[PDB]
Amino acid sequence: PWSGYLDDVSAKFDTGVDNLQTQVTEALDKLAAKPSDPALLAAYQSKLSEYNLYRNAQSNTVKVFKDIDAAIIQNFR
Amino acid sequence: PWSGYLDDVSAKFDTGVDNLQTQVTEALDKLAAKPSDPALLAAYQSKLSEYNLYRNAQSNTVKVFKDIDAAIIQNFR
Amino acid sequence: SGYLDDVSAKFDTGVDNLQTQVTEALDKLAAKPSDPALLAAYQSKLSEYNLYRNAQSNTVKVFKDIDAAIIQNFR
Amino acid sequence: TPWSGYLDDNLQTQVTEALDKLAAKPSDPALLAAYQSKLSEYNLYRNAQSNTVKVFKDIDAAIIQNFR
Amino acid sequence: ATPWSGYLDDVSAKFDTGVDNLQTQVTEALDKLAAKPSDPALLAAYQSKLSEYNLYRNAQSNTVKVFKDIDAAIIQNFR
Amino acid sequence: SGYLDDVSAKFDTGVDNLQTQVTEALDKLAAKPSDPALLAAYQSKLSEYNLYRNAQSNTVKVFKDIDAAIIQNFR
Amino acid sequence: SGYLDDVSAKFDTGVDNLQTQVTEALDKLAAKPSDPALLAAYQSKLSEYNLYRNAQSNTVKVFKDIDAAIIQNFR
Amino acid sequence: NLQTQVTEALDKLAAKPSDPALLAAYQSKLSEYNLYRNAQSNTVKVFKDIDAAIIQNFR
Amino acid sequence: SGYLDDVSAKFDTGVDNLQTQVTEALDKLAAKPSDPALLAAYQSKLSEYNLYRNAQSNTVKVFKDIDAAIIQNFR
Amino acid sequence: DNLQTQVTEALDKLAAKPSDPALLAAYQSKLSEYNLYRNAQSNTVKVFKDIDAAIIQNFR
Amino acid sequence: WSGYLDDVSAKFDTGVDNLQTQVTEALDKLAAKPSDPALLAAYQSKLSEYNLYRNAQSNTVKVFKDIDAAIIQNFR
Amino acid sequence: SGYLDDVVDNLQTQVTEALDKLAAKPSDPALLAAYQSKLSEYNLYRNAQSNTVKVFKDIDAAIIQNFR
Amino acid sequence: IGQAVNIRSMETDIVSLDDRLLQAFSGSAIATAVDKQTITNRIEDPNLVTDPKELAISQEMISDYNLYVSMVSTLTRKGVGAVETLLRS
Amino acid sequence: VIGQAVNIRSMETDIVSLDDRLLQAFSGSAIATAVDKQTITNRIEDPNLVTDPKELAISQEMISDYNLYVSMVSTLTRKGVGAVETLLRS
Amino acid sequence: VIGQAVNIRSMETDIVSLDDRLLQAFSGSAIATAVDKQTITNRIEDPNLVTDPKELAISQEMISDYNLYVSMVSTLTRKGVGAVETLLRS
Amino acid sequence: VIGQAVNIRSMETDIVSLDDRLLQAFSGSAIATAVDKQTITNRIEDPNLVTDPKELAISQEMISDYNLYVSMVSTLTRKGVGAVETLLRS
Amino acid sequence: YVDMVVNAATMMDKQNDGIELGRQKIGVMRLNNTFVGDRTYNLRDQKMVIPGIATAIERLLQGEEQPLGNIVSMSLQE
Amino acid sequence: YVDMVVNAATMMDKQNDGIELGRQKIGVMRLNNTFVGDRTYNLRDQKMVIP
């Protein structure tokens, strides 16, 4: 078991949004029972949007460091 | 059977609304026998509109999770 | 068959039956294009088929690159 | 090769494991986010290695060719 | 203590030469694809086979090249 | 004519009538641009033609690389 | 030590604090991934980093090749 | 020879650069021509290096 | 003169008027940006011009490479 | 020195308006031709004087 | 006191008389009122023109360094 | 140097100065574009010098060997 | 496909030294002449210069030719090099 | 780790002539070499070995070691005969 | 700055034979080299060092310095041997 | 094609002694060499010929043939002079 | 005798790479006590599925690498 | 004797890589006190599921 650096960059986001990963599935499990409640719709719109942004920013950030590292390693020649 | 994450997020709504998928048909075939009874009309209105919201919210949720996945898979390359 | 064929076949073995399910659902829908319950199922199945093929292709490409970059160094 | 008489693999398994988890449910965002990182690190590792092994070959060859 | 000599399969390789499976399969897969260029199940297969054929052919060429440079460098060392 | 011409012509013969089907269906559509039957018929043909041309060109490209990489090692 | 480390260091004494700032901005953003005020700052800092590291590495490569040429002409 | 075939494919293309059928034909012709020229030049060089090496050997 | 100039000029003579068909169709459109027949006319001319220039450049590039690879073997 | 002059003319016209595609298209060609010319000349000069040096080394 | 690749860069820098300042000016004006379409339309042109200027300059100096290095290699 | 012992400025200075200025702000296009051409001209100068020194020494070695 | 082989080619007894030369020289000059010809007409044929399975063969043929001529040259030079030292000394 | 052997005892020098020790050294070297060349060739053809990143990283080392070994032997033998030329011809 | 040490008066009232001067030079060089090769290999193996820009930028300098040092020692040695050959060789 | 001429009849001479056979072989080679060198120089500076693949493919051969021919004449001349020197020294 | 034996045997072994042993066979098996196909029971509240033997077995074996043996409730050729 | 033993041993080993013996077996296990499948129950305002 060996954590690299990219793993740490990712985990920074996971340990940032401490509970959002549960809140999304719990708000879904509320809503699916009674889809017509405005309070529940208003809640789930928010938590879903947040979860989208979080996963997107995480993946872009990992890609940029992957591209810096490769560009350095190509100069070892 | 085999079932992906999206299939799961879909089935959550099915198993959420226990019986509505039947009730809209039984209310319909009661009403069709006697279109002029207020007590049948007033029920059918609420059941049909609940079924409507149900299908819409299900389809939009599956669409959003698809697009989060496609966004991540675009970065493997 | 090499190692790429094996990587490729891992996806095809991981999804038990999707290639069949998607076709069947298509045939059920084509008979009755207007039943919401036939329609919602097909939406999900087709959506998953899409992702499966995309991931499968991008992975093979990455492994190819790692190999060609090694083989450049033999000489 | 050892200098005669002188006193004085996990990443591969980790990538294999993550691939096997992902292949079972290609639509899980958490399995995707994990695999992306494992594959990126493995790629960088293999490249840095093979470049270094060439650099040492070419130094030994230059030494021999200097006296040859 | 010394490592073992090994033992030599002198006859086998030179007459093991013969039509490779790999080229045969590449040409067969291409002929299947060209019949229906839009089937994803066939495209997925051909991507993989063509890739493997690319790697194999390069690895082989670079190896022949290395083995013959050694011999040219020996002869040029003695003349 | 070399080997690359052969690889191209395998696609040309693999699709029998597509080029003329496309040319035809376009002229039927252009005669009555507002008929849904003709529109539906045309979309599929043009899509097929697009994929055909792309696959053909990418394959010729790959083979050129394998050949140039071998020829480089004659020296 | 050496001159190529002197060249490498002439960058790191040039960008006083960037190496810290980037990680600090990352921690803030990770705390609230959806604040546009944070996002806008991180984009800048990350770009300035990417450029600094590329310019450094290519310069070290060039001075290495100048010295490797001279040490061959010693012969 | 190949020289003329390539020259003529070019002349037909430049008449209508937007025709896919012409483009596909040209890609193929220009590719084969490129490979031919390279292979020829490398072989010529190899034979001349051998010839020179013999003289350098007895010199 | 030179040979790459002949290759490049062969396109210019292949398309007789295009370099100033574009400039004229632009001058016409700029007078009445909202006329759909003018918009539809301009779209095709500008597309044609785009392709013309791309093909012209890439061909000169390929011929350059073939010449440089031959001249490399004079030594 | 004709092909030396042509390239410096082309460069001035281009530098006057770096975004004009007709000028760019012309300059690409002129620069490529000049680039091949220089290499060919230098390589043959080298060959011609390596032959003289090998003659002298033969009797030396 | 300078070489010939500086003469070649300076032919661009004196060729596009003023663009180098015009860009900064345009940005100073747009920053004050981002929602103005006339300013936006002007800035798009200046920024694109500047992007091409810099690319053409750098690729030309690269090519002349490749010619020179090849001639020097033959001094052997 | 500040020193003369009784009995303009060169590319070596100009490069060191342009690198020094650049390293203060690695992301300014004017400075980058000013530095590319100085690093290129310094690379060319420093190759051409060494190659010709090498030619003059091989000439003198051949003379001494010819009279051995 | 049109192929021929000459079978009864060589005599294996002990034989005068003068003719072992002629027979070696002639057999070698023949082999190299035909080898070189086949190389060149493999390059001129468009169906062979563009097939990746054929190019891999031409690469081997070229290299084998290079090595064979390098070795015949080297050993002949050392052969006359022996005689000239024994005689001068 | 699949199959391995080693030779534990070397024969006493008191019973072996000077030229036997040479024949015996030469033969052993010539065989270990032909066996390495063959091994590499076979690795390049097994499609599993030629397309797996793990296995290629091994093939690259094997070919670099073969190259250095043969360059070493071919250099030291040339120095060895050059000594004999220097003493006898001179 | 870590563990610095310097010898003083190295030649002030004692002088080594050339026989020993060569031997000390050889030993002090050979061990430094072998330790630098191990350091590089270890910096490549550790997953946390091959994935961080700060650590890669350090490793590029180590590889560059190793390559330049070994090339300079080899060239000077060859050139110095040549002079003794030109002296002794009749 | 345009403005082209050929000399039909060569002038002729008697050849009666080894002296004249030698001067004749010398003069025959000198001129062929000068002509070849000039031809190549022109082919390197007509811009229709420097930049066309078909013409470059020819110039390559002309350069090679020149190199080989002059190297042969040099070698055989030096061998002949060395044989004379060896016999007279002996 | 030794040379002939070694050569002959090596060629026999190589040529037998063109022969094939693994001819497939087809068994047709009628079920006596149950329906072959899978079934779905649309409970008024829930849809529930009972898979068929074919589905169950395929899902069980899918992706296996090793042989089977000992189903429970010359040597070179074998 | 030694040269024969060492060679035959090494070759037998290399050949045995082709032999495979870890063959799988199948066992059917009936349940006597519980249902095989997953079960779902509705609570006050949410579902409960037992695997």
From Swiss-Prot, chain E:
Annotated consequence of substituting V64A: Can only secrete early substrates such as InvJ/ScpT, PrgJ/SctI and PrgI/SctF. Does not yield assembled filaments in vitro. Cannot enter cultured epithelial cells
Keyword NAD: no
Impact when changing F15A: Can only secrete early substrates such as InvJ/ScpT, PrgJ/SctI and PrgI/SctF. Can polymerize into filaments in vitro, but not in vivo. Cannot enter cultured epithelial cells
Effect on the protein of changing L30A: Exhibits constitutive secretion of substrates. Does not display SipD/SctA at the tip of the needle filament. Is non-invasive. Can polymerize into filaments in vitro
Mutation effect (Q76M): Cannot secrete the translocases SipB/SctE and SipC/SctB. Retains the ability to assemble needle complexes, but is not able to invade cultured epithelial cells
GO CC list: cell surface; extracellular region; type III protein secretion system complex
Major subcellular site: secreted
Regulation: Binding of bile salts, including deoxycholate, to the PrgI:SipD interface may inhibit the T3SS function.
Annotated localization: Secreted; Cell surface
Induction per the UniProt record: Negatively regulated by PhoP-PhoQ.
Keywords linked to the UniProt accession: Protein transport, Secreted, Transport, Virulence
Reported effect, W4A: Abrogates host cell invasion and effector secretion. Can secrete effector proteins
A single MF term (Gene Ontology): identical protein binding
Outcome following mutation: I75A: Abrogates host cell invasion and effector secretion
Effect annotated for changing N77A: Exhibits constitutive secretion of substrates. Retains the ability to display SipD/SctA at the tip of the needle filament
Superkingdom in the source lineage: Bacteria
Swiss-Prot record, chain H:
Intracellular or extracellular location(s): Secreted; Cell surface
Reported effect, Q5A: Non-invasive phenotype
One of the GO BP terms on file: protein secretion by the type III secretion system
Consequence of changing L10A: Exhibits constitutive secretion of substrates. Does not display SipD/SctA at the tip of the needle filament. Is non-invasive. Can polymerize into filaments in vitro
Phenotype for D49L: Shows a specific deficiency in the secretion of the translocase SipB/SctE. Retains the ability to assemble needle complexes, but is not able to invade cultured epithelial cells
Family: Belongs to the SctF family.
Full protein name: SPI-1 type 3 secretion system needle filament protein
Organism phylogeny: Bacteria, Pseudomonadati, Pseudomonadota, Gammaproteobacteria, Enterobacterales
Interval of the full protein contained in this chain: 22 to 80 of 80
UniProtKB/Swiss-Prot annotation, chain M:
The keyword Ion transport appears for this protein: no
Keywords noted in UniProt: Protein transport, Transport, Virulence
Disulfide bonds: none
GO aspect biological process, one term: protein transport
Superkingdom of origin: Bacteria
NCBIfam families recorded: PRK15325.1, T3SS_SctI
Membership in a protein family: To S.flexneri MxiI.
Function, as annotated: Required for invasion of epithelial cells.
Protein name as it appears in the record: Protein PrgJ
Curated annotation (Swiss-Prot), chain Q:
Result of knocking out the encoding gene: Insertion mutants are hypoinvasive in the HEp-2 cell assay.
Transmembrane segments: none
Subcellular location: Cell outer membrane
Highest taxon, organism lineage: Bacteria
Subunit details: The core secretion machinery of the T3SS is composed of approximately 20 different proteins, including cytoplasmic components, a base, an export apparatus and a needle. This subunit is part of the base, which anchors the injectisome in the bacterial cell envelope. Forms a stable homooligomeric complex. The complex is composed of 15 subunits.
Function: Component of the type III secretion system (T3SS), also called injectisome, which is used to inject bacterial effector proteins into eukaryotic host cells. Forms a ring-shaped multimeric structure with an apparent central pore in the outer membrane.
Assigned protein family: Belongs to the bacterial secretin family. T3SS SctC subfamily.
Protein name as catalogued: SPI-1 type 3 secretion system secretin
Gene from which the chain derives: sctC1
